[PDB]
Amino acid sequence: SLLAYYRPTKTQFFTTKTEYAQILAQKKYFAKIMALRTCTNGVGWGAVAYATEKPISTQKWVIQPLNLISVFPDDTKITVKAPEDIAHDIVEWGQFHAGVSSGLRISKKATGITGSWIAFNKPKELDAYHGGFLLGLGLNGHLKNLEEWHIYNYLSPRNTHISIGLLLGMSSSMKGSMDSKLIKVISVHLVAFLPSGSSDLNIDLKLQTAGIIGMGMLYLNSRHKRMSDSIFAQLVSLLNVNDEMVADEEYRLAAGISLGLINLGAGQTKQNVMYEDLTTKLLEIVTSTYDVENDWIPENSQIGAVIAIMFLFLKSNNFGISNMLKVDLKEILKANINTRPELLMYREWASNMILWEFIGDDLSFIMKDVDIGVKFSELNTDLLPIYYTMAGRILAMGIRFASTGNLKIRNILLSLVDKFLPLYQYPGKQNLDFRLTISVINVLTNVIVVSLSMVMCASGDLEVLRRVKYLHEVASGPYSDLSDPTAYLEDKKDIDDHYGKFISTNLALGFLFLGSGQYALNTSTLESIAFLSMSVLPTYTTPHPLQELKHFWSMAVEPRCLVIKDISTGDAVNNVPIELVVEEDVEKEEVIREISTPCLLPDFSKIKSIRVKMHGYFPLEVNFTKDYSASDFFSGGTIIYIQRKSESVFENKASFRNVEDIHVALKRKAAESKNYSRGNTTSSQLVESLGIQDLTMVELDTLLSAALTDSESYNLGLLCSDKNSGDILDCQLELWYKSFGPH
Amino acid sequence: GINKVLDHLAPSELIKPVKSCHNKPSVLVLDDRIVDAATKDLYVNGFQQNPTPENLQHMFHQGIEILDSARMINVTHLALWKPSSFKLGNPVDFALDDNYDTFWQSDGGQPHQLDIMFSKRMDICVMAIFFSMIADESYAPSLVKVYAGHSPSDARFYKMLEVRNVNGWVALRFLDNREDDQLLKCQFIRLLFPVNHENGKDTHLRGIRLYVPSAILR
Numbered sequence: 001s002l003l004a005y006y007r008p009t010k011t012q013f014f015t016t017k018t019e020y021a022q023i024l025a026q027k028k029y030f031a032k033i034m035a036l037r038t039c040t041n042g043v044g045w046g047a048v049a050y051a052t053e054k055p056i057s058t059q060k061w062v063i064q065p066l067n068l069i070s071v072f073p074d075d076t077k078i079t080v081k082a083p084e085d086i087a088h089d090i091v092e093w094g095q096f097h098a099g100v101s102s103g104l105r106i107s108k109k110a111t112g113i114t115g116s117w118i119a120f121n122k123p124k125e126l127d128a129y130h131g132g133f134l135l136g137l138g139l140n141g142h143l144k145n146l147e148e149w150h151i152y153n154y155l156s157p158r159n160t161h162i163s164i165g166l167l168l169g170m171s172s173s174m175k176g177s178m179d180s181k182l183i184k185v186i187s188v189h190l191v192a193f194l195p196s197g198s199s200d201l202n203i204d205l206k207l208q209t210a211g212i213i214g215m216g217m218l219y220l221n222s223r224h225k226r227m228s229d230s231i232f233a234q235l236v237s238l239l240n241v242n243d244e245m246v247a248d249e250e251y252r253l254a255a256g257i258s259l260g261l262i263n264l265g266a267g268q269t270k271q272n273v274m275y276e277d278l279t280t281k282l283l284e285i286v287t288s289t290y291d292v293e294n295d296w297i298p299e300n301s302q303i304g305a306v307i308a309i310m311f312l313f314l315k316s317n318n319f320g321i322s323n324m325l326k327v328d329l330k331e332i333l334k335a336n337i338n339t340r341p342e343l344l345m346y347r348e349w350a351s352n353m354i355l356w357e358f359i360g361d362d363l364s365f366i367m368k369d370v371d372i373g374v375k376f377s378e379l380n381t382d383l384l385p386i387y388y389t390m391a392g393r394i395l396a397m398g399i400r401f402a403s404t405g406n407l408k409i410r411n412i413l414l415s416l417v418d419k420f421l422p423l424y425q426y427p428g429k430q431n432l433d434f435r436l437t438i439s440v441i442n443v444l445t446n447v448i449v450v451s452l453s454m455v456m457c458a459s460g461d462l463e464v465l466r467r468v469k470y471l472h473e474v475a476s477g478p479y480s481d482l483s484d485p486t487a488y489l490e491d492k493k494d495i496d497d498h499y500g501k502f503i504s505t506n507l508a509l510g511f512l513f514l515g516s517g518q519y520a521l522n523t524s525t526l527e528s529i530a531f532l533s534m535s536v537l538p539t540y541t542t543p544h545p546l547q548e549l550k551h552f553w554s555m556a557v558e559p560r561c562l563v564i565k566d567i568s569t570g571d572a573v574n575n576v577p578i579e580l581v582v583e584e585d586v587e588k589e590e591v592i593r594e595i596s597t598p599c600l601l602p603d604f605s606k607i608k609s610i611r612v613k614m615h616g617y618f619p620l621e622v623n624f625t626k627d628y629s630a631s632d633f634f635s636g637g638t639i640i641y642i643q644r645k646s647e648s649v650f651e652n653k654a655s656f657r658n659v660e661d662i663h664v665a666l667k668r669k670a671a672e673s674k675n676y677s678r679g680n681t682t683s684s685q686l687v688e689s690l691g692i693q694d695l696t697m698v699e700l701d702t703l704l705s706a707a708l709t710d711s712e713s714y715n716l717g718l719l720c721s722d723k724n725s726g727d728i729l730d731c732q733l734e735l736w737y738k739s740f741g742p743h
Numbered sequence: 744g745i746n747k748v749l750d751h752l753a754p755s756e757l758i759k760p761v762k763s764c765h766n767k768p769s770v771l772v773l774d775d776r777i778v779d780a781a782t783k784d785l786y787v788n789g790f791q792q793n794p795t796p797e798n799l800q801h802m803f804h805q806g807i808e809i810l811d812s813a814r815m816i817n818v819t820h821l822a823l824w825k826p827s828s829f830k831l832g833n834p835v836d837f838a839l840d841d842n843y844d845t846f847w848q849s850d851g852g853q854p855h856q857l858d859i860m861f862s863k864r865m866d867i868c869v870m871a872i873f874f875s876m877i878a879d880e881s882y883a884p885s886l887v888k889v890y891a892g893h894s895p896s897d898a899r900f901y902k903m904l905e906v907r908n909v910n911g912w913v914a915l916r917f918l919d920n921r922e923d924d925q926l927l928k929c930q931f932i933r934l935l936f937p938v939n940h941e942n943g944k945d946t947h948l949r950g951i952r953l954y955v956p957s958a959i960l961r
Binding site for chain 1: 745748749750751752753754755756758759760762764766768769820821822823828853854860861862863864865866886888891892893894895896897898899900901919920921923924927928929930935937938
């Protein structure tokens with residue numbers, strides 16, 4: 001109900017005033033704020049419904065348009081209209097996000113989704129919804145080979161959203177095949193990669209950023225030189241829009257992630273010459289200090305270079321590369337410091353991930369080498385780097401323990417969010433030094449809630465949900481309680497701040513309940529962390545660069561839901577205790593973990609044995625040796641079946657080997673009476689009435705009926721003197737009756 | 744110790760007194776007809792018919808040397824500049840050439856923007872702008888808003904400037920953001936000129952400068 005979007009949204013307003021006109025203004029402001037929430041619920045809804053609905057092929061898909069209509073407890077509905085109430089671009093950006101979620105809702109294994117099906121589902125009028133739907137299908141891995149017939153039909157209009165959706169989705173479906181017929185499409189789209197001297201063709205900058213990321217992700221694990229060098233030049237070089245030179249931070253960030261992904265896992269070298277040359281070239285970019293700002297190497301390329309040196313040595317444990325990336329707080333706080341401070345959080349997050357063994361789970365790792373060291377404890381710009389220090393370390397902390405679950409990390413994040421929550425969005429003394437610092441606080445508290453949601457993924461935690469609910473609701477900010485274009489820009493900054501504050505809480509909401517809680521993220525395969533890391537990129541500040549990439553954690557999501565089914569009946573049986581053998585995420589020996597039946601077990605590679613025990617079905621315990629892992633065992637399916645035990649009269653011939661505890665016997669009788677409430681009606685009673693329960697006694701009575709030949713006489717004697725059997729005394733006592741009884 | 748420093752980085756109950764901000768943007772008065780100690784601090788050339796341009800060119804100089812007379816460091820040429828658009832007649836060099844006769848003119852959309860983005864973290868303390876109400880009434884900047892931030896991403900509103908009558912250098916030192924430091928600490932500064940006097944279209948910029956703190960042989 002909190003996350004639903006295809007309905008009027010419940011609102012609560014402070015309105016700490018009595019004037020009617022003032023109250024209406026705040027309600028309109030809250031309506032505009034809630035309109036932002038509706039636009040940005042696309043990220044949340046995508047994770048809530050991952051592979052829920054299945055396609056019928058013949059059936060036609062439907063996409064619910066954005067409602068963005070707010071409802072107050074007073075039931076005086078206020079309806080937001082574009083572009084009078086909110087920025088015009090926001091409304092169809094939310095439509096595009098909703099379209100991606102709808103497109104992603106289709107399962108990966110679904111068949112029948114060919115190039116004709118999308119054309120069949122075309123709304124005959126291109127819009128943001130279809131562009132998102134086009135992105136979702138390609139993102140899921142359905143656009144493996146899209147026909148060239150309607151590629152031009154989609155791309156003929158210069159609309160950005162549809163072109164963005166096609167380029168990202170189509171590249172994602174193929175994902176590293178290095179096909180020429182598709183790579184040339186982006187090559188035409190990208191203006192700088194187009195041959196030099198050609199007359200400029202009008203291509204939107206966001207489209208190029210869409211083209212460059214799709215193309216780099218087209219070249220995944222290619223390690224491909226004639227493209228990688230061109231990408232490196234693209235990051236350094238300068239662009240052209242509207243016939244005038246321009247430098248974009250968004251494109252350079254898109255270029256940096258593009259280069260890093262193409263050469264992912266290419267840094268574990270002890271090709272090295274060109275890799276070392278590219279490594280030192282990137283380090284020159286990130287470490288160069290310029291007293292005078294050069295035009296063609298601005299600070300905008302710093303983030304792309306860091307995210308490039310991110311992915312090259314991912315999981316490489318190269319201490320030296322981390323050191324020249326890691327920044328020491330003690331030395332920098334003494335100095336004036338240089339470059340954008342936002343580079344620091346990327347740099348430290350870069351160093352921490354290189355050492356993919358030393359990500360500390362304790363607060364000491366977070367708080368390592370941090371001290372205010374100044375009398376002026378008031379919030380001042382001098383102490384921003386430690387905040388960006390904090391954000392980078394915790395983000396690496398959260399991604400490291402992704403979906404694995406824990407308690408110490410959760411408690412530490414709970415303490416951190418509790419401390420930083422009250423300061424959030426507090427424009428008390430309107431001072432820019434204070435205002436810039438608290439903007440970083442907003443960025444920091446967005447990182448903490450995301451990371452806290454990351455580590456506790458798919459758990460449906462209470463307090464984590466409790467906090468993210470808080471950051472979800474109440475706009476707060478300058479309005480409520482706690483020259484025309486200028487006021488437009490002044491309102492534009494605040495409305496954009498609320499949009500960035502909402503995307504983080506929405507993303508946290510979706511990850512708490514991923515795939516209805518039965519799907520979990522992957523951090524085993526090398527590229528999964530790459531997609532996890534890229535999608536978790538904090539771009540919450542204006543202009544929210546590269547936002548459409550938020551719907552890309554989908555490659556890292558999978559089963560790891562385990563359930564039990566019966567064999568003879570073939571139906572599912574649940575609510576049986578399951579004991580698990582784990583490594584406690586550390587080198588410790590083991591801890592027994594008891595869980596219910598429909599529960600998300602930890603990663604298969606860390607599990608050594610699993611056993612099922614419950615009153616009734618006989619136990620089944622399997623231990624995983626080095627030869628076979630749990631992943632290989634569950635490769636055919638994540639479901640293991642169990643055989644039913646039998647309460648047969650024939651089992652208890654004369655004596656009961658069963659203990660027959662009084663409590664379970666009373667429970668069984670009560671259970672049977674419940675069905676009886678909702679007698680010789682059972683065939684077992686019939687065979688009991690026949691008096692032929694004892695199989696052996698009956699047979700020997702028939703055999704002894706008459707003789708007593710020596711061979712058979714010794715046979716019965718052998719059965720009488722059996723080392724182990726059941727009704728031995730009954731057998732002994734029959735033969736005595738036969739031998740010396742009345743006749 | 745770990746907890747106490749986190750409290751210093753994150754003062755939860757210590758900071759927020761009442762949470763009762765007015766949230767309105769403060770407006771700075773630039774008029775030169777009233778004499779006050781605070782105005783004299785920000786207005787340098789002194790309060791005064793319209794002077795002829797040669798007096799304007801004259802007074803343009805003493806305002807320069809008076810600002811340069813005090814112990815101060817000029818880093819106007821230590822950053823990259825990118826206006827909204829040129830007019831192919833005069834780049835921002837004629838605005839930063841410290842010459843009244845030459846000036847820079849933009850030509851494009853009504854909300855003209857002037858970008859001052861720095862390479863390194865430099866702490867600016869005094870902001871110097873020269874205006875000419877009578878020499879450039881057609882293109883006089885009537886409405887000025889200065890931003891602040893550490894990057895083009897995080898540019899934020901800093902101060903309000905309404906222009907009624909200023910023929911002279913305007914000194915803009917920053918005290919609101921940091922009362923302890925009495926200076927501004929940002930790497931990204933941008934200026935907007937959304938409207939001119941008497942409903943003008945374009946805007947000049949006669950002078951601009953940036954101030955930061957810190958016999959011979961031939």
